[PDB]
Design a binder for this molecule. Sequence first.
Ligand code: NA
Lengths: 64, 87
Amino acid sequence: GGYNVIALDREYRHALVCGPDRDYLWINSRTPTISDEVKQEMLAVATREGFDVSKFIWVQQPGS
Amino acid sequence: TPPRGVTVVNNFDCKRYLGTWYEIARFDHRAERGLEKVTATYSLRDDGGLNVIFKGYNPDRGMWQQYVGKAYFTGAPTRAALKVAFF
Ligand code: NA
């Protein structure tokens, strides 16, 4: 299966990752939680590239 | 092949991507559905590929479970396009 980093900040702390098509997408962090600011920028990259962000499941993590 | 009309990162330093990433959000599929506290851990193979260790908590089985995979760059290691297999 295809695996592609389609966004990444400068200190490799936050990544947007998609599969071979727009049914596969993940938001990853070096920390268990991200900030709204960081969330909105991620959603904003997802939408700009045509991903249906209503499909996100917000995964249980320590502090969430 | 990546989806049609997407940007892939093109200045890519593999070594700096390694180690542990928490999964904040996912589009659901059978492989992951219901899993909690998910991380993926990336490490460099002898053959220049990446090892991928996916880990999550399974509340219905009451166990931590992992999936073991390998990833290969489809083009150059400076472009973050890859194929993943799990065995
Ligand atoms: Na908690």
